[PDB]
Amino acid sequence: MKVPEKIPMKPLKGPLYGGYFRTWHDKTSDPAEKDKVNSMGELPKEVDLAFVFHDWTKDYSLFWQELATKHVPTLNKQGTRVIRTIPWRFLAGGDHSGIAEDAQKYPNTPEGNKALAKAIVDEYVYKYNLDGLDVMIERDSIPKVNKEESKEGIERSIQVFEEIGKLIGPKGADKSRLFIMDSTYMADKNPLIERGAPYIDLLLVQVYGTQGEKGGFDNANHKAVDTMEERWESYSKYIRPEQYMVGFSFYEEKANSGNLWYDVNVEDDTNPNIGSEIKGTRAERYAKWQPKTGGVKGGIFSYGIDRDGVAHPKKNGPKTPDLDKIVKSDYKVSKALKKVMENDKSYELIDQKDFPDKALREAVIAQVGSRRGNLERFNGTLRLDNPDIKSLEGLNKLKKLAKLELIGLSQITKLDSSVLPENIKPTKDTLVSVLETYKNDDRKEEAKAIPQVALTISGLTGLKELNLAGFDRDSLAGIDAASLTSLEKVDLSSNKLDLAAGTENRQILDTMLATVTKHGGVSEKTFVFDHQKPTGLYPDTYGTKSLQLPVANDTIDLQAKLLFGTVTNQGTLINSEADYKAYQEQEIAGHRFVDSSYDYKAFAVTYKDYKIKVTDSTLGVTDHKDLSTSKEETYKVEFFSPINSTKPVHEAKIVVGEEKTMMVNLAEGATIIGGDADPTNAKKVFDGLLNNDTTTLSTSNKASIIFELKEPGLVKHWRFFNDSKISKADYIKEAKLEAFVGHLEDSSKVKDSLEKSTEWVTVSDYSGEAQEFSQPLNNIGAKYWRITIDNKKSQYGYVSLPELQIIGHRLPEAATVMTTMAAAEELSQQKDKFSQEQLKELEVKVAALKAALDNKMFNADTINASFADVKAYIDK
Ligand SMILES: [Ca+2]
Numbered sequence: 001m002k003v004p005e006k007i008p009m010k011p012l013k014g015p016l017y018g019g020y021f022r023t024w025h026d027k028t029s030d031p032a033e034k035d036k037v038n039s040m041g042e043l044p045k046e047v048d049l050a051f052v053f054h055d056w057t058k059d060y061s062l063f064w065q066e067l068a069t070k071h072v073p074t075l076n077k078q079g080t081r082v083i084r085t086i087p088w089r090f091l092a093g094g095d096h097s098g099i100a101e102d103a104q105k106y107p108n109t110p111e112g113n114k115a116l117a118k119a120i121v122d123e124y125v126y127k128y129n130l131d132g133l134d135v136m137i138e139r140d141s142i143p144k145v146n147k148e149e150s151k152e153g154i155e156r157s158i159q160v161f162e163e164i165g166k167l168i169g170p171k172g173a174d175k176s177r178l179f180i181m182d183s184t185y186m187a188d189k190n191p192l193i194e195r196g197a198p199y200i201d202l203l204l205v206q207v208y209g210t211q212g213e214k215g216g217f218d219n220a221n222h223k224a225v226d227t228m229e230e231r232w233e234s235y236s237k238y239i240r241p242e243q244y245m246v247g248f249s250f251y252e253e254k255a256n257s258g259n260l261w262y263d264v265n266v267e268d269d270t271n272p273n274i275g276s277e278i279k280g281t282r283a284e285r286y287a288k289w290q291p292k293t294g295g296v297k298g299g300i301f302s303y304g305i306d307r308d309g310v311a312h313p314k315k316n317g318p319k320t321p322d323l324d325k326i327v328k329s330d331y332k333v334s335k336a337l338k339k340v341m342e343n344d345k346s347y348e349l350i351d352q353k354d355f356p357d358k359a360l361r362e363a364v365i366a367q368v369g370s371r372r373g374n375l376e377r378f379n380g381t382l383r384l385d386n387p388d389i390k391s392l393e394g395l396n397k398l399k400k401l402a403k404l405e406l407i408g409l410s411q412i413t414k415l416d417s418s419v420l421p422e423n424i425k426p427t428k429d430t431l432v433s434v435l436e437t438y439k440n441d442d443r444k445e446e447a448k449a450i451p452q453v454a455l456t457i458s459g460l461t462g463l464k465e466l467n468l469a470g471f472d473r474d475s476l477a478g479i480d481a482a483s484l485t486s487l488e489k490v491d492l493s494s495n496k497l498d499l500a501a502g503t504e505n506r507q508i509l510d511t512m513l514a515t516v517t518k519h520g521g522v523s524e525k526t527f528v529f530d531h532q533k534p535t536g537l538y539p540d541t542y543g544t545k546s547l548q549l550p551v552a553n554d555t556i557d558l559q560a561k562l563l564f565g566t567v568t569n570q571g572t573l574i575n576s577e578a579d580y581k582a583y584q585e586q587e588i589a590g591h592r593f594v595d596s597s598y599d600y601k602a603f604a605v606t607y608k609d610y611k612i613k614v615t616d617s618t619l620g621v622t623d624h625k626d627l628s629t630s631k632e633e634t635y636k637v638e639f640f641s642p643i644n645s646t647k648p649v650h651e652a653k654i655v656v657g658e659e660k661t662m663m664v665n666l667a668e669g670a671t672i673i674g675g676d677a678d679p680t681n682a683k684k685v686f687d688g689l690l691n692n693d694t695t696t697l698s699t700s701n702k703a704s705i706i707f708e709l710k711e712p713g714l715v716k717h718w719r720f721f722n723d724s725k726i727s728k729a730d731y732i733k734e735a736k737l738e739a740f741v742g743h744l745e746d747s748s749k750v751k752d753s754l755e756k757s758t759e760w761v762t763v764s765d766y767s768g769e770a771q772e773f774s775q776p777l778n779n780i781g782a783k784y785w786r787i788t789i790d791n792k793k794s795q796y797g798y799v800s801l802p803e804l805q806i807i808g809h810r811l812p813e814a815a816t817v818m819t820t821m822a823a824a825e826e827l828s829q830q831k832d833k834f835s836q837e838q839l840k841e842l843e844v845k846v847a848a849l850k851a852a853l854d855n856k857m858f859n860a861d862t863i864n865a866s867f868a869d870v871k872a873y874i875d876k
Contacts, residue, residue: 018301132178165199275311346373701797
């Protein structure tokens with residue numbers, strides 16, 4: 001075969017139209033299927049990108065001959081590129097994987113994956129001298145081995161995608177070939193976008209049908225999901241708006257259910273040509289659709305463009321077999337859709353009418369884009385640092401800039417609303433979507449507020465008038481006042497500027513004031529800054545983090561003591577009405593700045609929906625705000641804002657009397673060893689949750705758990721809960737806690753008497769009817785524990801246990817420490833010892849380690865000394 005070399009073509013320019021031509025509908029594919037009447041070569045010049053979509057189970061060798069020798073030169077001559085489409089699979093190997101089926105020639109190794117990428121471009125692109133490669137990423141093309149989805153193959157396809165990107169596309173060795181990704185997936189579900197995005201020229205999203213357009217529907221919340229705007233935002237992380245193309249489908253002959261998109265007009269006997277009309281179709285809506293932010297899109301594309309013009313069978317009308325007949329298309333829908341995008345307001349060029357100043361127009365064109373649609377949508381930074389700019393006229397046409405930077409424009413004498421972006425001040429979005437919506441969501445659809453542009457000004461050494469009044473600006477940050485050596489008039493009134501002394505706002509304001517009073521008259525009209533209503537925020541950090549107070553019969557309000565205050569965005573703490581009136585009447589050069597109307601309740605934060613979590617040294621927790629002092633105890637107070645009850649906003653330790661050490665729950669995450677409780681819910685007793693949503697049921701009516709603390713320590717307390725939501729009648733009514741002393745009967749170690757047959761020691765024996773029970777315990781160092789519970793109902797009692805706590809202090813191998821202090825007085829129980837002249841010392845210690853172990857303060861240093869001291873007598 002004699003493949004012609006590539007003829008010259010102009011660069012692709014938006015708006016772009018794409019079409020997927022199914023190869024089995026080319027005349028030349030099967031000269032025996034005389035019903036196949038179309039030809040790829042007949043596509044019109046309105047088609048920028050013609051994808052070859054093939055049935056990989058056929059040869060069609062005569063078609064590839066016609067493709068390479070007639071159709072590609074014909075299409076290239078009109079500016080149309082011919083793109084080879086391949087399934088995702090082809091980059092992975094495995095089932096039906098094309099070239100990659102030869103795993104022995106292309107092994108899954110670093111060198112083999114580089115060889116496979118090169119073979120892929122050689123075979124699917126360069127063989128017929130095509131213009132690029134389109135990898136279709138969707139459920140129907142996913143890597144599979146023996147019909148099952150291959151996570152390994154997916155991992156491999158990422159490696160091979162990169163390697164192809166080194167050969168073609170914007171980062172490839174051959175930048176004349178496009179590298180395209182088309183996908184049905186949202187970006188977070190696309191396994192290849194994160195690594196592949198830098199390598200592709202274009203990203204195509206297949207959004208056929210009403211579910212592509214409106215999103216799917218979340219029936220639990222009655223809200224759309226995966227909407228067209230959400231899909232674009234998910235990929236906006238990875239590609240530029242002009243790289244994004246959205247796809248609809250024509251009607252494929254004999255389409256089954258699940259292949260019925262209705263993207264073109266439904267048939268009508270009384271207008272046999274309505275299939276070729278586009279007005280109001282989903283395809284026309286995609287031609288018209290534009291994201292609300294970023295920029296204008298790259299274009300749209302059709303699936304099954306050989307069916308261009310066939311009308312769509314009715315959803316629930318009779319069989320219409322005429323539509324399933326194959327006919328020669330005139331490509332009329334495609335030509336019209338292309339004209340719709342070409343003539344659309346968004347794609348009009350930015351020109352002198354938008355920006356008169358030639359040098360400004362060229363900085364906007366370079367950073368924002370060439371299209372007027374982008375003025376409406378671009379939401380990044382605009383840097384203006386060419387001093388040759390003589391007029392900032394036009395910048396008002398920028399609607400959603402994140403940041404404006406005016407740097408060293410020595411020729412700009414004025415700044416005000418006429419030469420500033422529209423969102424210098426608070427504004428809402430005015431674009432209106434062309435898409436259908438789910439009326440099954442009769443909820444919002446409301447014009448989202450646009451964030452205000454950040455304003456940076458420096459080196460405007462000819463700026464004479466700055467007027468920013470009435471804009472609700474939140475700060476002056478970004479104004480390098482010390483370069484505005486030519487200021488004569490400044491107005492900053494009616495904003496949200498905290499100008500109180502000590503703030504950086506004040507410094508910028510004061511430096512400007514220095515510039516203007518060194519100039520002429522500083523009249524009541526020359527430097528105005530009043531009527532500021534700055535925003536009251538929550539203090540990031542609070543004042544009191546610890547309070548020692550005496551044991552008294554007083555109920556203290558912890559929230560009034562520890563949590564109050566409001567803070568401006570510059571750090572001005574206001575705790576009170578009194579504080580705020582002092583603030584209201586602050587002054588600059590004999591003039592107040594805070595607005596006279598600005599009430600304290602207007603400005604001031606509130607703590608209505610805030611939550612408190614008070615925890616004592618024995619781990620008892622309450623959410624009571626008023627705390628009593630009547631009891632020698634040490635607490636941990638925490639406050640939680642309504643928006644988040646997992647991380648606290650402020651915490652503080654409250655000591656009543658002499659401080660006790662904070663104990664921990666040593667049973668947290670304990671391992672279930674044995675007993676008759678259900679193992680899954682037995683685990684949940686120790687995971688740490690007081691009212692587990694999940695079922696806490698241990699058995700039907702009496703249960704036991706043998707368990708093992710992760711890190712054994714010194715136990716001083718225990719606690720267990722019944723779950724509220726249940727009646728007292730179903731509460732645990734008798735409990736028995738036992739510790740395993742006399743370690744490991746018959747031992748066996750790895751072989752394990754699940755301790756089911758030994759002499760354990762009963763540490764507690766509960767008999768009551770309360771929701772929560774807690775009790776002090778006498779210094780046990782056991783690692784193995786058993787609890788038995790009984791709610792005293794019938795055999796079908798379904799006894800339940802949300803949480804059990806074994807509470808004390810972390811002491812590594814405290815059992816040996818206990819075994820000694822116990823054996824110490826039993827080697828004073830052998831008592832056949834003389835040592836009376838000796839042992840003033842042997843006693844001044846088992847009553848000093850004893851006295852240090854029982855001290856509310858837990859000093860790990862003391863006890864580890866005193867214990868190692870007494871076993872100096874293993875030497876008698
Ligand atoms: Ca629990």
